[PDB]
Amino acid sequence: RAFTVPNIPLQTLSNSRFPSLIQGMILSPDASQVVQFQNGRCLIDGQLLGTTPATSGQLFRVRGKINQGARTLNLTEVDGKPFMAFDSPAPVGFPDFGKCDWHMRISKTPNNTSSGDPMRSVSVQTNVQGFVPHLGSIQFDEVFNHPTGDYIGTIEWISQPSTPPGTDINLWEIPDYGSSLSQAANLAPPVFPPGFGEALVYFVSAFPGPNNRSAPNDVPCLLPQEYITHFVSEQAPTMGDAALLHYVDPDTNRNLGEFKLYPGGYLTCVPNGVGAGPQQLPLNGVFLFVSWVSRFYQLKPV
Amino acid sequence: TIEQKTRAFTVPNIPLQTLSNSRFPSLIQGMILSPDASQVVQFQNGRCLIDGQLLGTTPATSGQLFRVRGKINQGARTLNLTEVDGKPFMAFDSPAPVGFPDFGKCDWHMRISKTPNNTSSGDPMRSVSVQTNVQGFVPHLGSIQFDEVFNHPTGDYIGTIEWISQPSTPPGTDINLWEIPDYGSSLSQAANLAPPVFPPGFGEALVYFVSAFPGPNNRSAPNDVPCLLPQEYITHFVSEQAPTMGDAALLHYVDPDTNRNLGEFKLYPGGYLTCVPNGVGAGPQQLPLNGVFLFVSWVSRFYQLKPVGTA
Ligand SMILES: CC(=O)N[C@H]1[C@H](Oc2ccc([N+](=O)[O-])cc2)O[C@H](CO)[C@@H](O)[C@@H]1O[C@@H]1O[C@H](CO)[C@H](O)[C@H](O)[C@H]1O[C@@H]1O[C@@H](C)[C@@H](O)[C@@H](O)[C@@H]1O
Ligand SMILES: CC(=O)N[C@H]1[C@H](Oc2ccc([N+](=O)[O-])cc2)O[C@H](CO)[C@@H](O)[C@@H]1O[C@@H]1O[C@H](CO)[C@H](O)[C@H](O)[C@H]1O[C@@H]1O[C@@H](C)[C@@H](O)[C@@H](O)[C@@H]1O
């Protein structure tokens, strides 16, 4: 099967770390930034990595059992199937927002009642001893004095981590999935800056909550979720060092810039000096697969 | 181009249990027939022709789906709607902004926040409620009305429905997610509503994909939200724009373990699926959820399907 990417404008595509439209395309503020996101990780032949779901339905949800009077949510997969501990960093689609406090909204499922607000607020710190999703559990800040059951929900807003005091949100990082006696197994590996004039491209969407900068919380990811779904369905074999893409204005068919899509599931470009980069481009463009290229192909600066 | 006008029709090669509802973002949890065999539906989301033409308020992707955005003044009850990206909603052009919820016959309990963040601390989340059968529910006219005065700063608010409950009026009536709200008013009805979808008859019945949405109802049961197409199908069709080459696309719902056909379905160009239930009580609800719909052939609308399920 021949390789393709979805024929949909970037601004209509979705973040792969949480369900939301993509609102920007950027380089990392630190040129040396290494990332290790667990969601939005997919080899371009359709192999999912880390905790990455095939589709948005599973993305950025948390599900588990909790007993009345406990602080611990014992995780399952989003569809209620058992989570196999020690195997993966966390259930598929589990949030990968590091360096922040999570303020979640959850509810008991299925409904078995004729009245009542089912929504419960809980908070999760990700750098504490009780945050051990790789062992199958996370700990809420407070005792959960609500009925025992199967709860499902998501993070509604984030704030600065409670500890160390004063530290800011840093969404370039992932939480500590592991425990005191065990590192998390099968983490999607780190992605390093490519060098040779190339730079990683990140797709960003704003997420609710405060921070020390009194500005939006911007969530960077490596691939639009629709690209992931496409690759999972298509399973097109990787036949070059990189897939050369053109970012095309669909109104005019003008090529706005060359990008490389690497087998590992990330995009690069060559910024044309400081100030230049993909953030200068309109967001109504569509990426188009042009050709497989070798390791010796040099991108035209953007 | 020649390639574009000859592009072969395809559907996403992903098991149903991994696909998403197109009326709100969630995994599909089942397939059902409508309890009433005469049920006509007119959902505004999850509506797409199989050549990629979006209908109603249907977004191309899940990013825009089931969101509400607008401006509200402190001390007011009126949310003046915009598109999800903050751009103006061109009223009269559509029933509502793209992705606007189409949950009829229920009270909406929403969570919204002021955007963008300009704070260094504080919970930004606000609870508001919306009734859909009241005078103030006029999304087609560009606004909806909250139950209570909004005593929070004037600004641009974004959010969604978090949970639903029975309509407040008429008192005692139940949630009915088969219905859409009245988008317009008595003086102005909603323009460019996606058209109704009617039972095909002659042995065929419409297939609905369901996902549970939080909240109570009179039956103490999950609020199962039915939709006509998985969202991934819609995104696929928008991207592919494959020409429709026949009356209907014959699909086989195939078991990935055995490669056996578990059921025959027809996908009609209007963007909905039918099957033939194998007697009373039989239907697609009896099939496992790990099957994959595979495109077999273009067929005539008169093509007869092998009955599905067991009586
Ligand atoms: C627990 C809490 O609400 N902490 C607030 C802190 O609140 C108060 C400070 C002092 C008094 N007092 O002297 O009487 C009373 C309340 O206020 C500061 C400044 O507004 C907040 O930053 C702080 O919020 C917490 O901050 C830490 C990081 O230091 C972390 O981000 C927590 O998640 C965050 O708590 C969350 O937000 C607050 C506003 C509240 O909604 C909590 O329920 C949330 O967990
Ligand atoms: C307004 C309200 O909360 N209505 C509740 C009702 O609440 C009360 C009952 C009695 C007293 N009192 O004696 O003083 C005070 C409040 O409680 C019944 C259950 O006994 C709920 O069914 C009712 O909830 C409302 O029900 C109507 C349909 O009849 C409709 O679904 C409303 O949306 C729903 O209100 C919502 O749920 C309640 C629980 C609450 O969360 C509200 O804020 C929601 O809007």
Ligand code: NA
């Ligand atoms: Na940990």
Ligand code: NA
């Ligand atoms: Na109305």
